[PDB]
Design a protein around this ligand. Structure first.
Ligand SMILES: [Zn+2]
Ligand SMILES: [Zn+2]
Ligand SMILES: [Zn+2]
Lengths: 501, 86, 546
C-alpha cells in the first residue's frame, strides 16, 4: 500500500500539472494526502512497530517519506523508536548475565553493537533527522546509565569502571583507533565521568610504573581524545606522570654513568622515582630488607642525598619486581617474582623447612599479605606444606619441573582487585563531598547573601559536567560548613545564608 | 642458592623540611588536628585527612583550609597554593 | 558598564575563587561598549597563563562565545596570539593554545582561515620538532573538516606542505598526514587531486624503502574511501601496482593491498568490473595462506575473507560464478583454527546466502557439503562457532524451505547437545531454539517422527528455565512441536499419547503464574490454545480448569 500511495501521489501531480489549472495544485495535494495517509495512521503505527521488530530498512524509509508530509505526524514514530531502542539495549545487556559484571569487553561490545546498528538505521532511513537523533541519544543514555549490570552492583558507577577497564585492556600488552573512537562516543552518554577519570588515571599509573604498554603513540592518541572530550585540568594532572617518568629515566641513566667510576654492583638495577603528590600509590606495609639488596639501596640513597638536599625517599616494596636465577633445583631456571616472593624465597638457600610463625618474624611481613603470597607460591608448584595456621610447617619441595626456562610466578591476588575497587569508590565519594563544599564556598564568596534554591541551582550547574549531586549531600555539606564557621544563617528571613569571613 | 639477576624498584620522594609532622600544627601527620583532637568527635572529625599540593607539601586538610582563609600562599614556599591530592 | 569594570577588577584579585567566579559570570553574560572589548580580550588571553587549572579551563571555554560578539580585528589578533603561542617553549602554553585554537575553529571566517593556513603551513613545513608538527596537522585536519571549500587559493600550498610528510621517521606524522589528505580530497579542485594521484603513483613505481610503500598504499586506500567516484578513472593504472606488490613476501604489505582491493570493490563499483576476476583470484589464493601449519599471518587471511565478503555483497549479476568457485573454498575453509578468521568466513558465506534471495539449484547441490562441514563444527567447545553454525542453518532454511530433508538425523543431535550443556550461554540456547523452530516450521511432519522422543525432554527442560527469554523461545518451539506431533490437515499414524502429559504440565505452570513477564504470558496462552485445539480429546478433567 505504501508503494501504491506513492505512485498515486505522483500520478496526481502529473494530472494537475498537465491538464488542470495551477490554483488546484495545493488543494489536490492536501486532499490526496489526507485521504491516503492521514486516515490510516493507526495502521501505520502498528506496521512501524512490526518493521522495527523485523529489520526492514527500505520499508521504514518509505514510511518516513510518506508520513513526513503530514503536519506533526512524526512524533509518535520518534516515541516508538526511542522505546524500541531502550528495550533492545536492556534486552541485549540482560542476555549477557553473570559474566558481564566481570567482563568489560562483553559489556562494551554489546553497547557498541546496539548503538552502531541503530545509528546506521537513523542515518540510512530517517535522513539523519534531528528528532530521531535526539531519541536515539536519550535511549542510549537511559540504558547505559541503568541496566541489569548496574542493578547487580547496586550502583550506577559500574559502567564507567567497566569502560575504564576495557580501555586498560586495549592499551595493555590500526584497528585500535576505531575502538578508541567508539569508546569516546560511549563516554559522552555517561553521567558519572569522575569515576571513569579516576579509574583510568590509576590504571595508567599502573601501566607506566610497570612498563607494560602496547605503544606510546596509542597513549598519546588517547590523551588527545581525552583533551577533546574532558577538560584541560585532567590532562594537566595526567601529564605529570609522563614528566616524572622522563625525569626518572634520565636519573637512572646518569646513575648508571656514575656507577662506572666505582665498584660494580652484584645486580642489574633500575629505579622509578616518583613524586608523592602526583601518583595514587599509598604507603607500603612493613618489610625487612633482605641482606642481598642492602648495597644497592644504600648506594642509591647516598646518591640521591648527594644530588638533592631536602628530599627523602620512601620505598614502595609492593610495586617492585625482578628476576631470580636459581641453581639448587633439578636444573637451571630463571624466576620472575616480586620483592615479597624473593623475601619469602631467598630467606633460606640450604635450609629445607620453616615455620610460618617464625618466617613472618624473620621477614617482618603482616599476616594477611604473607598468607596470600604463601598460597600464591603454593599454587605455583614451588613450595609444599586448604587453611593456614601459625604452627603450620612449610618446606621447600625439590624435584619441581617446568616446561620452560622462563617462569612468571607473579600473579595478582584475588582480594586485591576487590579491595582496590572498594577503596577507589569510597575515595570518589569523599572527593565529591569536598568538591561540593568548595563550590558552595565559591558561590557564597561571590554572592554575599543568597537563598537556598539559587545556591542549589548554581551548584548543580557548576558540577554538572562531572557528576550529578544529590540534594541530601548538598544539605549535609551546607550543615558541615556552617559548623566550621564558613557561612551563617541570618536572623529572621528564614532559609537564607550569608557569607562569614 | 638463589641469585638476583636484576631488580626494578619504585620509590617516592617527599620534602624533608618536616619530619613526618604537620607544619601549621606540630603534631604527627597521620594523627588528628589540634582542633579535632581537642574538641569532641563529630562529623567534622570523620573527614580529617592529609592534603597535598603542587609543590608536594603535605598538611592536614583542616590546617591548610584554616590557613587559606586569610592568606593565599603556601606556608613553606611562597608560591600560590593549589590542591592536587586528598 | 559598571558590571564589566567590576568583573575586570576582580579578575586580578590574587584569589582563585574570585577569578573563577568573575570568569564564570562573564561567560554567562556572553551566552545571553567598544573600548571595554580591548580590555576583556587582553584579560582572557592573559588568563591562559594563570596558576590555576580551573581558570585556564574557564578561559578556554570563554574563547568560544567571545569571537561571535567581537569585532573582526580583535578576532584576528586573538588568532595571531594563539598561533604564535603555539610555537612557544612551555608545554602548557602549547597545549592550551592548541585547545583554544581548536575551540575557535570549531564554532564559527574566510579571513581568519586564510590567516591560520599560512601559520599551519609554516609549522608543518619545519621538521625540527615533532610535537608542533602533530598539533599543526591535527588543527589543519579539524579546519578542513568544516568550511574547507573556502580555501580554494591555498590548496596547492596545502598539498606542497603535506606531501613530503609521508616520509618522516615518525609514524604518527604519517597517519595524521593521511587523514589530512583524505579531508583535503573530500573537497578540492581537479588539478590538486590529479597531481596528488600521479605523485602517489610515481612514488609507488620506485621502491625507495619498504616502509614507504606501506604508507603509500594506505594513503591510496584512504583516498579511495574518501573520494570514491573521483578515483574510478585511474583504476586501470592503480590495480597493476597493487597486484605486483601482493607477491612481495611481506606479511604486513599483503594486508594493506587486500584492504585497498576491498576499498576499490566497495566504494567505486561502476569502474571496477574488469578487475573483479583478478581481485577474486588473489583473495582465493591468499585466503588459505599459512606456512607454519599443515592440516602473525592471520591478518592476511582476515583481509582476504573480508574482501570476498565485500565483493559478494555488492555484485548481484555474478551469482553463478560465485557458486562455481567461491562457495567450495569457503565451505572447505570452515575448519579454520583461528576464531576471527572463521567468523569472517562464516560472515562471507552468510552474505552470499542473503544475496542468493538458477542459483537455487546450485545451492541445493551444495547443501550436503555445508551439512558435512557444519556437523564437525557443532561439537566444538566454542560458543561463537556454534552460534555461527546455528545462524547459518537458520538462513539456509530461510532461503530454501526444504533444504535439510535428508540431513535431520545428523543435524538433530547437534541441536540436542547444544540445548543441554552447562557451558552453553543464554544466547547459544536462544539461537538453537530459534533454529529448531525454523527447521520445524518449514519441513514435513513425517521426518521428525523418529526424533520426538529425543526432542521432547530438552524442550520441556528449556520451558522451565529460570531466564524468561529461554522460556519464551521454548514455548514458541513447543507450539510448533504440538502442531507437528498431531497434524489435522493431513493423516498420520504417529502415536502422541506419552508426550501429551509432559507438554501440558510444562505449559500449565507458566499459564498460572501471575508474576511472569508479559511475553511469557502471551506465549503460554497461545501454546495452551494450540494444545487444546490439537489434543483436546486426550486431556481428562484438566480441560474445564484450563
Ligand atoms: Zn596540622
Ligand atoms: Zn583535622
Ligand atoms: Zn609548598
Amino acid at each position: 500500500y505504501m508503494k501504491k500511495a506513492e505512485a498515486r501521489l505522483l500520478e496526481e501531480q502529473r494530472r494537475v500539472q498537465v491538464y488542470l489549472h495551477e490554483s488546484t495544485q495545493d488543494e489536490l495535494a492536501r486532499k490526496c494526502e489526507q485521504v491516503l495517509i492521514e486516515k490510516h495512521l493507526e495502521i501505520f503505527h502498528t506496521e512501524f512497530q512490526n518493521l522495527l521488530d523485523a529489520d526492514k530498512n527500505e520499508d521504514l524509509g518509505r514510511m518516513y517519506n510518506l508520513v513526513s508530509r503530514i503536519q506533526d505526524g512524526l512524533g509518535e514514530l520518534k516515541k516508538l523508536l526511542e522505546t524500541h531502542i531502550h528495550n533492545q539495549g536492556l534486552a541485549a545487556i540482560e542476555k549477557c548475565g553473570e559474566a558481564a559484571l566481570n567482563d568489560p569487553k562483553m559489556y562494551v561490545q554489546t553497547v557498541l553493537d546496539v548503538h552502531k546498528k541503530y545509528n546506521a538505521l537513523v542515518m540510512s532511513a530517517f535522513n539523519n533527522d534531528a528528532g530521531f537523533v535526539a531519541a536515539l541519544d536519550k535511549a542510549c543514555g537511559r540504558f547505559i546509565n541503568n541496566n541489569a549490570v548496574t542493578k547487580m552492583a547496586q550502583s550506577s558507577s559500574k559502567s564507567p569502571e567497566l569502560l575504564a577497564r576495557y580501555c586498560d585492556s586495549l592499551l595493555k600488552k590500526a584497528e585500535l583507533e576505531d575502538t578508541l573512537n567508539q569508546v569516546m562516543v560511549v563516554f559522552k552518554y555517561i553521567e558519572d565521568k569522575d569515576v571513569f577519570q579516576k579509574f583510568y588515571a590509576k590504571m595508567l599509573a599502573k601501566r607506566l610504573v610497570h612498563q607494560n604498554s602496547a605503544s606510546d603513540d596509542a597513549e598519546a592518541s588517547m590523551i588527545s581524545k581525552l583533551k577533546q572530550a574532558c577538560g584541560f585540568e585532567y590532562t594537566s594532572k595526567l601529564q605529570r606522570m609522563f614528566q616524572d617518568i622522563g625525569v626518572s629515566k634520565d636519573l637512572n641513566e646518569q646513575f648508571k654513568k656514575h656507577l662506572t667510576n666505582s665498584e660494580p654492583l652484584d645486580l642489574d638495577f633500575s629505579i622509578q622515582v616518583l613524586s608523592s603528590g602526583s601518583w595514587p600509590f599509598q604507603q607500603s606495609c612493613t618489610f625487612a630488607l633482605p641482606s642481598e639488596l642492602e648495597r644497592s639501596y644504600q648506594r642509591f640513597t647516598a646518591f640521591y642525598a648527594s644530588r638533592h638536599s631536602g628530599r627523602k625517599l620512601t620505598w614502595l616494596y609492593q610495586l617492585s619486581k625482578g628476576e631470580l636465577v636459581t641453581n639448587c633445583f633439578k636444573n637451571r631456571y630463571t624466576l620472575q617474582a616480586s620483592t615479597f616472593q624473593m623475601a619469602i624465597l631467598l630467606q633460606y638457600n640450604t635450609e629445607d623447612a620453616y615455620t610460618v610463625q617464625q618466617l613472618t618474624d624473620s621477614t617482618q611481613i603482616k599476616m594477611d599479605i604473607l598468607a596470600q603470597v604463601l598460597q600464591i607460591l603454593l599454587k605455583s608448584k614451588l613450595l609444599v606444606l586448604v587453611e593456614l595456621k601459625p604452627d603450620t610447617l612449610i618446606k621447600l619441595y625439590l624435584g619441581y619441573k617446568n616446561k620452560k626456562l622462563r617462569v612468571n610466578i607473579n600473579v595478582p591476588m584475588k582480594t586485591e582487585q576487590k579491595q582496590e575497587q572498594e577503596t577507589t569508590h569510597k575515595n570518589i565519594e569523599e572527593d565529591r563531598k569536598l568538591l561540593i563544599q568548595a563550590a558552595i564556598v565559591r558561590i557564597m564568596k561571590m554572592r554575599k547573601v543568597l537563598k537556598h534554591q539559587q545556591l542549589l541551582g548554581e551548584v548543580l550547574t557548576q558540577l554538572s559536567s562531572r557528576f550529578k549531586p544529590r540534594v541530601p549531600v548538598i544539605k549535609k555539606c551546607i550543615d558541615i560548613l556552617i559548623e566550621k564557621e564558613y557561612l551563617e544563617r541570618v536572623d529572621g528571613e528564614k532559609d537564607t545564608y550569608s557569607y562569614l569571613a | 642458592r638463589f641469585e638476583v639477576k636484576k631488580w626494578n624498584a619504585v620509590a617516592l620522594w617527599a620534602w624533608d623540611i618536616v619530619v613526618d609532622n604537620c607544619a601549621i600544627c606540630r603534631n604527627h601527620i597521620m594523627d588528628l588536628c589540634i582542633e579535632c583532637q581537642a574538641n569532641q568527635a563529630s562529623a567534622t572529625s570523620e573527614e580529617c585527612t592529609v592534603a597535598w599540593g603542587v609543590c608536594n607539601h603535605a598538611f592536614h586538610f583542616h590546617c591548610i583550609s584554616r590557613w587559606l582563609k586569610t592568606r593565599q600562599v603556601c606556608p613553606l614556599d611562597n608560591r600560590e597554593w593549589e590542591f592536587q591530592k586528598y | 558598564s559598571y558590571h564589566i569594570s567590576n568583573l575586570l577588577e576582580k579578575m586580578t584579585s590574587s584569589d582563585k575563587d574570585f577569578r573563577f567566579m568573575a570568569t564564570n559570570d562573564l561567560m554567562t553574560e556572553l551566552q545571553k561598549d567598544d573600548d571595554s572589548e580591548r580590555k576583556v580580550v587582553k584579560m582572557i588571553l592573559k588568563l591562559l597563563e594563570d596558576k590555576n587549572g580551573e581558570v585556564q579551563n574557564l578561559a578556554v571555554k570563554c574563547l568560544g562565545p567571545l569571537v561571535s560578539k567581537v569585532k573582526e580585528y580583535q578576532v584576528e589578533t586573538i588568532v595571531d596570539t594563539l598561533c604564535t603561542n603555539m610555537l612557544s617553549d612551555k608545554e602548557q602554553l602549547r597545549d592550551i593554545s592548541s585547545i583554544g585554537l581548536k575551540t575557535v575553529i570549531g564554532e564559527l571566517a574566510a579571513n581568519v582561515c586564510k590567516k591560520i593556513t599560512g601559520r599551519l603551513t609554516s609549522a608543518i613545513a619545519k621538521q625540527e620538532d615533532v610535537s608542533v608538527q602533530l598539533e599543526a596537522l591535527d588543527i589543519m585536519a579539524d579546519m578542513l573538516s568544516r568550511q574547507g571549500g573556502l580555501l580554494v587559493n591555498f590548496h596547492p600550498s596545502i598539498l606542497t606542505c603535506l606531501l613530503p610528510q609521508l616520509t618522516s621517521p615518525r609514524l604518527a606524522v604519517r597517519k595524521r598526514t593521511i587523514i589530512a589528505l583524505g579531508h583535503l580530497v573530500m573537497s578540492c579542485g581537479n588539478i590538486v587531486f590529479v597531481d596528488l594521484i600521479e605523485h602517489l603513483l610515481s612514488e609507488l613505481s620506485k621502491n625507495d624503502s619498504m616502509s614507504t610503500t606501506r604508507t603509500y598504499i594506505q594513503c591510496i586506500a584512504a583516498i579511495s574511501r574518501q573520494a570514491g567516484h573521483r578515483i574510478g578513472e585511474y583504476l586501470e593504472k592503480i590495480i597493476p601496482l597493487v597486484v605486483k606488490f601482493c607477491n612481495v613476501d611481506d606479511d604486513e604489505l599483503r594486508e594493506y593491498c587486500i584492504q585497498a582491493f576491498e576499498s576499490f570493490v566497495r566504494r567505486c563499483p561502476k569502474e571496477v568490473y574488469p578487475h573483479v576476476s583478478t581481485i577474486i583470484n588473489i583473495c582465493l589464493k591468499y585466503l588459505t595462506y599459512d606456512p607454519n601449519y599443515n592440516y602473525m599471518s592471520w591478518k592476511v587471511r582476515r583481509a582476504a575473507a573480508k574482501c570476498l565478503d565485500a565483493v559478494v555483497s555488492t555484485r548481484h549479476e555474478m551469482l553463478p560464478e560465485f557458486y562455481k568457485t567461491v562457495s567450495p573454498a569457503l565451505i572447505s575453509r570452515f575448519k579454520e583454527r583461528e576464531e576471527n578468521v572463521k567468523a569472517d568466513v562464516f560472515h562471507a558465506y552468510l552474505s552470499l546466502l542473503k544475496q542468493t534471495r538458477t542459483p537455487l539449484t546450485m545451492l541445493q547441490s551444495q547443501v550436503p557439503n555445508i551439512v558435512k562441514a557444519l556437523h564437525k563444527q557443532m561439537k566444538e567447545k566454542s560458543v561463537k562457532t556454534r552460534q555461527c553454525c546455528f545462524n547459518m542453518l537458520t538462513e539456509l532454511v530461510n532461503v530454501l524451505p526444504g533444504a535439510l530433508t535428508q540431513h535431520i538425523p545428523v543435524l538433530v543431535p547437534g541441536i540436542i547437545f547444544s540445548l543441554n550443556d552447562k557451558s552453553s550461554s543464554s544466547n547459544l540456547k536462544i539461537d538453537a531454539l530459534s533454529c529448531l523452530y525454523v527447521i520445524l516450521c518449514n519441513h514435513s511432519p513425517q521426518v521428525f517422527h523418529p526424533h520426538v522422543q529425543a526432542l521432547v525432554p530438552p524442550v520441556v527442560a528449556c520451558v522451565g528455565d529460570p531466564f524468561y527469554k529461554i522460556t519464551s523461545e521454548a514455548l514458541l518451539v513447543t507450539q510448533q512441536l504440538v502442531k507437528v506431533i498431531r497434524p489435522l490437515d493431513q493423516p498420520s499414524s504417529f502415536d502422541a499419547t506419552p508426550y501429551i502429559k509432559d507438554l501440558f504440565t510444562c505449559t500449565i505452570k507458566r499459564l498460572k503464574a501471575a508474576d511472569i513477564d508479559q511475553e511469557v504470558k502471551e506465549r503460554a496462552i497461545s501454546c495452551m490454545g494450540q494444545i487444546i485445539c490439537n489434543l483436546g480429546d486426550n486431556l481428562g478433567s484438566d480441560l474445564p480448569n484450563t
